[PDB]
């Protein structure tokens, strides 16, 4: 079994335009959104069908109440941060928590926060401390660290409770998440060579170009969504007229290697 991850995200904004929510909270398994909530809907709702299928309304009822609280706890923390930055205008604050079930059975855990999309506080569950980037964060670190139980608590959630939510969600979406769709890879000339994969899932794939059996000096494209639950990517290389070379595209995806000779 491969590397799956459960993440929960949270955003806050201080002065949102009348349409925009001041609080959004989306959960993912891998690339797949599973949950959403925001200050307008004020309901926590499944964003994937194999979530709605498998979790009774008692679950959504419970977590909606909770997020209505967390929404307001976030307006508290963000209002405190902007006050001490002496920042006018509109600013953002973001939370992200989650674990990772690795291929080998080993696990991970992470928890952090940002201000204007830049690191603020990064939890370290093994030293049981917090890393401040500036003295606004340092103030917060000194508070949350005083509360030793709240650092202990987060460790146990990250290392036990998160992994067990991940294992349950990975079952629920067995088909979407534990499926392989091999890529279709083609080369063509532009003067540059272009390797091009499409139609594959999971999104995690590896593409490069070898010049005679050595990894060359390569321009890499991005792994992009096609829209039908699969993904596509490319890697180009420029050609040397003044000498001959054999060129090759290598594509690794879900435990299967591919080579396209030119």
């Amino acid at each position: 079994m491969r590397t799956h991850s459960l993440r929960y995200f949270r955003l806050g904004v201080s002065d949102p335009i009348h349409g925009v929510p001041e609080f959004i909270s989306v959960g993912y398994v891998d690339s797949h959104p599973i949950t959403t909530y925001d200050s307008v809907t004020r309901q926590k709702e499944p964003r994937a069908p194999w979530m709605a299928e498998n979790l009774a309304p008692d679950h959504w009822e419970r977590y909606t109440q909770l997020l209505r609280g967390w929404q307001q706890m976030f307006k508290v923390e963000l209002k405190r941060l902007q006050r001490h930055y002496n920042h006018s205008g509109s600013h953002t604050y973001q939370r992200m928590i989650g674990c990772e079930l690795l291929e080998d059975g080993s696990t991970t855990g992470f928890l952090q926060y940002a201000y204007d999309g830049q690191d603020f506080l990064i939890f370290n569950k093994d030293t049981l401390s917090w890393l401040a980037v500036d003295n606004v964060a340092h103030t917060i670190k000194q508070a949350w660290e005083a509360n030793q139980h709240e650092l202990l608590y987060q460790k146990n959630w990250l290392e036990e409770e998160c992994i067990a939510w991940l294992k349950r969600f990975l079952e629920y979406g067995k088909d979407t998440l534990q499926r392989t769709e091999p890529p279709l890879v083609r080369v063509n000339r532009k003067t540059a060579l272009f390797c091009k994969a499409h139609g594959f899932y999971p999104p995690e794939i590896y593409m490069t170009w070898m010049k005679n059996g050595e990894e060359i000096e390569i321009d890499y494209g991005d792994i992009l969504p096609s829209g039908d639950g699969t993904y596509q990517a490319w890697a180009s290389i420029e050609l040397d007229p003044q000498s001959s070379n054999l060129y090759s595209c290598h594509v690794e995806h879900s435990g299967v290697h591919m080579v396209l000779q030119v």
């Binding site: 109440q65 909770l66 609280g69 509360n147 139980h149 709240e150 987060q154 146990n156 959630w157």
Partner: peptide
């Protein structure tokens, strides 16, 4: 009747 600073807070 009881109260707490927040809910969710496991400690």
């Amino acid at each position: 009747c009881a109260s707490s600073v927040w809910t969710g807070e496991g400690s």
